[PDB]
Design a protein around this ligand. Sequence first.
Ligand SMILES: *[C@@H]1O[C@H](CO)[C@@H](O)[C@H](O)[C@H]1NC(C)=O
Ligand SMILES: *[C@@H]1O[C@H](CO)[C@@H](O)[C@H](O)[C@H]1NC(C)=O
Ligand SMILES: [Cl-]
Ligand SMILES: [Cl-]
Lengths: 15, 15, 15, 174, 169
Amino acid sequence: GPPGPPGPPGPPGPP
Amino acid sequence: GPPGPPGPPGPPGPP
Amino acid sequence: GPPGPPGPPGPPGPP
Amino acid sequence: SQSGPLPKPSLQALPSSLVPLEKPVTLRCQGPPGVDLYRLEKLSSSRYQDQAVLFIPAMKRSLAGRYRCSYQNGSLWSLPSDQLELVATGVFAKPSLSAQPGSGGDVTLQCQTRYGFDQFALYKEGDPERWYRASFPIITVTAAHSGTYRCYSFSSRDPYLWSAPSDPLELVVT
Amino acid sequence: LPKPSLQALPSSLVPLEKPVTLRCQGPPGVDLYRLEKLSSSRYQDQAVLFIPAMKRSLAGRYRCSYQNGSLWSLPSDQLELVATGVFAKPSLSAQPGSGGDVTLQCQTRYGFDQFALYKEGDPERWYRASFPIITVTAAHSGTYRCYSFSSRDPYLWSAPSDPLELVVT
Ligand SMILES: *[C@@H]1O[C@H](CO)[C@@H](O)[C@H](O)[C@H]1NC(C)=O
Ligand SMILES: *[C@@H]1O[C@H](CO)[C@@H](O)[C@H](O)[C@H]1NC(C)=O
Ligand SMILES: [Cl-]
Ligand SMILES: [Cl-]
């Protein structure tokens, strides 16, 4: 089948 | 076939 | 179907 | 066996990534020759397609935003492209640009607009083009090139919904 | 969404070539864990990292977080992973100071501009200085050691000094 959706975003960066 | 699973999460964000 | 691509960067971190 | 990640493709908006409402734009993803599958996506939405090219015949508020693409070789995904920022232009009345030359090499320009916008963007024509962003309608430019300047106003609430471009202002240095 | 803990086991001070394991720990049942090293900004989608043999290159700051549903947790507190034994150990001495104060000297050849002294025990007492001289106020008898390092690379420490077995009156 066709490839799955794009993964979700990574977590927010550090300070 | 059916669409694959989502991709992995993206990188962490920048500072 | 194969997995989707890795997601994008998370947002910016606190300053 | 393979040395590293597949190089990212380019992502381009023609004729411009600043697109007035109701005008056409074409997003094109381009990797090396022989790509099995291109994926073009819009960030912060569930929207994506398995095609290199997205043709938007009439630009809409809802299509404004961040895009990227990547491609697949076998089941392996490439590094993603640089993020394309697709701006919907002409959502608001154009501002009026004015300019006050300074006493020593600087020029203060003003993007006047009848609203409470908090973001303004000033540019000079002809690549390399030169951009300037400010949270305030007054914008000071040092060592300014002669050229044709225009400005845009918008709100940080929807930073891809921009005003129509101001009428051009013609700066000449000597 | 509450932050996880990130531990180095058996310790966050890790002699070169000795093992350590980084473990991220949030609530049970969660979808995914993300462990990152900050300087190099490389990372993994797993809760545990085993380092069979500590290296200069693995020392540094790390943090982690987890994702449940599509939602990210607050990030763990930052884990300072330090490699020890990168330099010859220093030599520790002690003298009186004023009242109940004890003055320690952490002596070393190289130009090092940072020093860390501790007393074994539960919990451990830690002291720091840029000069190789460390006052312990109201000092307790115990087993002391010190480490010397550079602020140019604050995560590469010397081997620990031979223990100083202090008895205070
Ligand atoms: C796909 O990978 C094969 C080898 O596995 C290589 O021959 C080919 O150039 C690749 N194509 C692209 C566009 O990466
Ligand atoms: C994870 O997600 C499920 C719902 O999908 C929720 O019921 C469960 O309590 C979550 N667990 C934690 C620790 O947040
Ligand atoms: Cl442009
Ligand atoms: Cl210890």
